[model samples]
Target chain A: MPYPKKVTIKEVGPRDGLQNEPVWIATEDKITWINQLSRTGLSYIEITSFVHPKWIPALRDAIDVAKGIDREKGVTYAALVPNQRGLENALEGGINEACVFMSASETHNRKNINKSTSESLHILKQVNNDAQKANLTTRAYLSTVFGCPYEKDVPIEQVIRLSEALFEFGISELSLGDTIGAANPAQVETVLEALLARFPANQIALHFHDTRGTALANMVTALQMGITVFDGSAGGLGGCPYAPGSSGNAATEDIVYMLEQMDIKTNVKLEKLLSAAKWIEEKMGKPLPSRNLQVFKS
Target chain B: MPYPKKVTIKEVGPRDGLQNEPVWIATEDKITWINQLSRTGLSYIEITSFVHPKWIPALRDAIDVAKGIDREKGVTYAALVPNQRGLENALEGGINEACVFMSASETHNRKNINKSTSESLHILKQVNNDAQKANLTTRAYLSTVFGCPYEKDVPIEQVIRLSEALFEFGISELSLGDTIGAANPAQVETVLEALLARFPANQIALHFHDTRGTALANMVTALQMGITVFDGSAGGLGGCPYAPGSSGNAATEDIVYMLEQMDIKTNVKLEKLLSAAKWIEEKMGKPLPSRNLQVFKS
Candidate 1:
């Protein structure tokens, strides 16, 4: 097994986790919660999204949250920006990196962004160019790289083509997302085999969801295949409101726990991460899908 | 990557799942659930435990339920028997195999079975001997093989010694259990590396709990090491009632789903198994931690 000596974990709770919450967490609470994360030794945090407020009403206070939280020197604060306007909003809010997204499947792209894959990429290029000109690093979240909800078979060729386009447009790292959490473990290794042959593993981050309870299994597969970067939400947030027990992105604490126990360094404290997850769970007044957090008591 | 071409999934819901429940399910309901599992192409089902009723009151109807269930041809009906009396009860209830259990750690053996490791092994020897005389195959559950709740670390030497003793006692298979869900992926490989060097892979089963969300990950590791048999609970039942969202065993449907999705053959049909899980969940009137079952509609 090609296990890496160290792994990088990017905290996506503030953006991806809270983005799907139906309940409105007050701006002050989001700020306080984010400050809690900044001190958790996390190297990177997706602070908020600059996506249109109407599209994601839950994170409409993204600007206030971005401007309100205290920033740490080492942690990179990133924000999702769909287009030029979103990029401008993120810049005004002092985002360290500009994050953009699009689905590899044409069908998902149309429904998710109200644009076809071609149209979304065209707009994202402009956003990427503007961010590069502003001297900020940029990353892209390529959704449905493993599978798509709208069109189940998102061909590997599509993922390859999109990765080529995004990297050509000045994207530094690409986060391949199992947007609907339909990825299987072996398939993850297979996909990485196809991608890593063409690109360096350092430039790719795997963003898996636990919807099918195989996220950690897939993570283990990726680690064995020499992957060292992963995207996770604290407390495994972003699940469907109707199905409270099901999960979205993998839990950050769970990821760290597994990595550290395996003798791989992540440099993130599990105690602080679970505490933040617990605090956020109480703030939302709902039980989260994080297994470790449920069993954890301070 | 030595992903097995096929994997054996043993259903442990009826025994392990119900054994931990606070609410006693009707014996008739359990029989019906076991009947449902029998038709779902599950080859082996631990129908119930023959432990003392005073200890596991929830499964006190083990005799009645085992006697009530309609047995299907080609299915191996197993039951957990703690001693000769438990073995006698299992035989009276019509068991195909007598499954026994003990912890690799001395402390857990005391709290779990009210016997030290030595005492538990001595009693289990008698249970194994009686079952052998009755022409019933015997299997053993060696708990805390990965880690223990009471004693933080269960040494590899202890697991090795217990495994050797159990195999020497005419046990056909040893199910190494992560009883409290305290296992990691790499550690699974390391543990299996030690065991498989001295034992055949066919004579071992990995019983993992999802209490910490690493069961599937650990399963993937075990499969890579050529271990086949796995123990799973239908609907991911048997979590602590206090923590409703935490899981117990890796869900049968979830395990089957992963194995089949990777093109590894599992004879159990997914549609039928998930339906059985759903039926059992409805009977219990509780939300199960099975990720696939939560999202399944039909």
Candidate 2:
């Protein structure tokens, strides 16, 4: 088994996980998690999203959350954005890196961004231009890279096209998001291997949701294939508010635990990560779907 | 990608699943599930076990269960047995096929059967001789084939040796039992592939517990690798009564659903499988841990 030379993890719990909870976490809690995670060797974190409060009342405090977080030295604070409007909001909150998502499937893309992929790209072009003006690094999110829940078996070529278009939007890097977590290790290897052939390995990050619980296996396949950067949420936070039966982002602590146990350096302590998950679990008033963290007690 | 050729599912809800349930299902209810599953195109259904009542009080009514099941034509009815005593009981009920189990990990072997591997084999020698005398086909269950929760990282060679030993003792088929469900697909592939090298593919069966939510995926890997037979419980019933935190076998209906949907033929039908699961759920007063069945409902 070829080991990963080095690995970088993008922590996304504060945004992806917290937004899914019906009970709004206090802005202070979001600040606490981001500040704690930033200090604990995570170099990049998806801190919040600039989506409208009407759509997600839970994260209406996104502005306050971004401002409240202690932006530590060497930590890159990022947020997810939809259009020029979200970029405007991110700028207002002093965001450094931003990611825009486009779905591989047309049905998903329309519902995701309220426009078809072509129409959304036009909006993304303007947003990219605006982000460049503000000197903000753009990271693009291409969802359903493996398979779409709404439209099963998304064409890999379409993912490539969306990703290439996103890169043309002045993005510094690309993070492939498995929105529905339907991709097996073969599919994961297929997409990442395909992309790695065209794009530089460092420019690609993996964002996998564990909807069908293939996250870690997929991660191992990616690691063995020379892809290093990955995205995970604390406590496996956040089911897609829009997608039914859609589960949350991959659990941060679980991935760390698996990697660390495999002798891969993650730089995050298990106890500290579990604490973050526990804190989120407290706020959400439901168990986080993180298996490793849950086993902390056992 | 090497897509699977076809997958065959062996339903074990009656014997493996209900044996661990806290609530004791009546003979009629067990019969109902067995008959319902038979109609679902499930070719193999383990009707019940013939172990001592002292060991498994939940299946104390083993004789009644075996007698009560409606023996549908073309469906294989099997039972689990420990030694000559249990085999005698199964023979009394006229079970055509029976399973014998031994643990690969010494710790689990000692704890489970109160003997080491060699000692267990000595006992199995007697059991196998008696089974042959009875003219019954035997499927030896080699538990903890991948990793033991207690010992962890069980030797693949040990699993292979145990199966070989059982086969030498006149066992026609073998089921690699992931008793703790601590196995990942890599482990599943590694061990099963190792066994396949020495044993014919038809002589091997897959039995997975959904303890870590990897059972179904592991089964998929096994199927992809040419394992045609598997053991699954209806509603994913029958966790370990002794092993702490261990869950039941993979739900038969759930596996059947995925297989049938993929156009792979199983003797089990969809509607009858649901009826069986629903009947058990009504008796248990909670939903079973079958992913596909639960997802299709909610």
Candidate 3:
């Protein structure tokens, strides 16, 4: 009953969602989709990730997408940066904000970025400071905060320690991610409580995947604990390539639908969001797993 | 989180689930599935409904299924009854418990059962008395307590009045159902808070459909409010035909997986229950929508 009256939704469809797709989406289409999402009242959209094309060929046109989007007024366009080179590319592409990520588990960090946890953090700290110096907002993504396929039961102390480091490094916010969608509400409560005790709730955001249908439940728990920002995908796109059988990120339309129904102020238009989801589903040549999308079509 | 240490799961796959499937499963298969589920440590199983075959031909062999299952010790085999005739048939079929149902909304009550709410309640009162006199346990189901497909925003006072009347009939438990799967966590908390103020948490059970992907989130809210019993369908079977585009009931395995991960005891063996779900999936000739089943197979 102590939940917030309004929550912020950070749409991650253009970056995390399309990065895991098998079919390559055209850079034009990615830009169009991001523009469509922008008009749906989403204030923040991760436009694309500026990693090497060799690593994620699907998002190979990241720079094109970042430059091609019709950035809406009052909305922030973000790009993921892995190192100084990626951050330089994002800044050159005129990105409004920069996002950097590392994993809570050492094995996942090494597997994902081919760097040790300390190495990734060392790189991100410099990138975050550089982004802040450029007068651009920076957000930190902490993956595997719940559980990891390679290293299970990531200790809460690691998350807290990493969060504190990221915040101190001048990032505006930190997104706690359930990398493999292995988080339950109880674990969410336990982790969020530990982090909230140390940091302001506004400085913490949640990024959950619906791998076991627990993403929304985890959001409910976080909201009750006074956290306001959440990350979601447009059509529930994006599965963990490393974690087989995991579903996509929590759907933006579905999240908006639930929040609106509960009388919470999301400020997103559900009909417009569904139209965008449907458009992307057609472009992807398959149905997305978003419940609201299914209900809308049905 | 003031969640209960343990919760009761009432399996309703045989009744609510099968009744909505397009294909007619053989009575023997239904019996086999129920027998498989009984060993998974579920204390209550609603085997089938004794409605007229003309009404729900998929469950036409309700009596045969009720009589054919291998009733395990320490388990209660239950069946839904619409009137005196259905109760008589359930009794003769050796059902351990008889369940009566009505809708919270007047329009939905008439649309679903073709009877006024008052008429249905009057009949269920007699049915309850007869079942109790015959030494059979009785439970009541209140459909559309959250929202109705035909009529939305069912007054909470109506729900309280209907619940009071059902409890006055000497029923053991009352299940509040989100028949259309339109409930949000805040609405759940508000409605449940009103109900729990007047009734013991132990006497109230929640039955939610995953139509909008809010079932698990709503479950988390109810758990935090100290309600214990929940109704689920194995393999996520069952959709309300009257509610267009609504999905299946909350899957039993998914609920168990979440609850067990949260450190709340359900006394159910997840692996064994998943095996049963897989068996039904094969018989149904398609994959079910249970997230845990998808994860287990992947």
Candidate 4:
């Protein structure tokens, strides 16, 4: 088992967890979650998306949520902005480190982002350029890092090409996503080892979904590979309305629990983060599959 | 991946599952379960034990259960005998095969069987002598093959020595029991492979407890190592009364599901197994952690 030097948990509960909730959480609730999360010592907090309201009504209050965040000194509040227009909206909301999504699978790129792989790359270039001109840090998110939901077996060459493109576009960090949650530890280890062989680990982040009940196990496997930044949702709330079988990004509480249990220091405070999860679980009226939160409740 | 040619599933529901029921199952219920399971195409079934009533009131009807079984020709009925007295009782019940239990961990053996390792071996030898005279098939059962509940990290050499002793005792089959379900697939593969190198595949059966929810996964790994004859309980009924934090054997229905799904034919009817499981579940008056029945039910 490879031990991590230091762990950085990038809480994605605001964006990933909310997108999957059936009910539209009030803007105040979103703001309330983000505010509670900011104080948790999380190094990065993905606050909201700058996507169109029609595309994701769950995050219709994205603009309000972005502006409402009490961005602390240490926590870097980030947002996912799809295009140049979304980037403009994010800048308007004073959002700095915004991320843009592009898929390694060409088919997934077309179906997910509604653009072909090359087309999405071109669009990401424009978004990166806009972020650079506005003096905001841009992180190009690479989805389907391990496996593709549409294509099933996504090649490493595809993932490497997209990652290299994002790097060339001047995106400072790349978040590798197992968007379908179809990866096992061996798969995660194999793919990460390959990626690490080609790229430096310094600017890499991991985004995993717990759709297959393997989120925590996968996280442990990835942490061993020296990948630091990870994405998680508060109360594991995120799911895409369009992604047929997508679940929330692995619950924030679960990842935090694993990290803390291993004595890997993540700045996130367990007590406050769990309270945020409790608030969400109560409104959702369902048990979230976060092991840490479950432990707390039990 | 190292793949095995076949997997033997040893159904221990009649002995392992029924041995610890809260409510007493009548001699009829025990007989019905044994007979019902026999037709499920299980290669081996541990029908009952020949223990004193005072020790395990739940299995006081063991002799009657063994006698009542039709002893279908294809299935082998193995009964557990705690001592020479118990072995005599099983022989009186016309049991064809007798199995003796010991632990790889000395701490577990002393507490479990009230004997040191050498003392337990002496009892096993006596049991073997009696079985030899009766022309009864014998299996030396070693419990706590992996991590012991009391004495953690049971040495592999201890297990090997136990297996070697069983082989020398004129026992054709040696069964390894993961008393506490603490084993992962890697451990299962490693230990099983080591055992297989010394023992013939047909002479080895796996007895796994699903205490940590790794039984089925461990079964798959063992199957990949050409192990057949596994022990599973119907509706996950039996748990060790003495061993705290341990759960029942792998559920029969759950194991059958994975085996069938993998196109590994068990000749076990899916509906029949589920119905049997459902009946037992109703008798238990609670939900079982058997994924096969649960998945098929809903």
Which regions of candidate 3 fall more than 4 Å away from where they truly are? B242-246
Candidate order by decreasing DockQ: 3, 1, 2, 4
List the pairs of residues colliding in candidate 3. Answer: none
TM-score of chain A of each: 0.97, 0.94, 0.98, 0.94
- List per-prediction Cα lDDT, in the order shown: 0.89, 0.76, 0.90, 0.76
Over the stretch B152-238, how does candidate 3's per-residue lDDT look in tens digits?
779999999999999999999999999889899999999999999999889999999988889999999999888899999998987
- Ten residues in a row with the worst lDDT in model 2 chain A? A239-248
lDDT (10s digit) by residue, model 4, range A1-298: 4457578888877887777677778898778767878887787887888888898888888888888878888778888999988988898888869898888888888887699989999999998998888999888789877777678888888888788888988989899988766566557778888889878887898887755444655666677678888888877776543353334477777677656645577877888898888888887776664544644564
On residues A50-154, what C-alpha lDDT tens digit does candidate 2 reach at each position?
A: 989888787888889889988988889999887888898899898889887777789888876678989888877888888888999888877777777778778
The TM-score that candidate 3 achieves is 0.98
Q: Please provide TM-scores, in order, for all candidate models, with all chains considered together.
A: 0.97, 0.87, 0.98, 0.67
Best by DockQ: 3
TM-score of chain B of each: 0.97, 0.92, 0.98, 0.93
**Model 1, range A157-195, lDDT digits (tens) per residue?**
888999999999989999999877888888998899999
DockQ values for all predictions? 0.62, 0.20, 0.68, 0.11
Question: Candidate 1's residue-wise lDDT over B60-170, tens digit each?
Answer: 898998899899999999999989978888989999998999989998889877898988889888889889999998999998888887898988999999889899898
- Tens digit per residue, CA lDDT, model 3, A152-203: 8789999888888888898889999988888888889888888999999998
Q: Please give the lDDT score for candidate 1.
A: 0.89
10 residues in a row with least lDDT, candidate 1 chain A: A239-248
Error of 1 at A216 (Å): 0.5
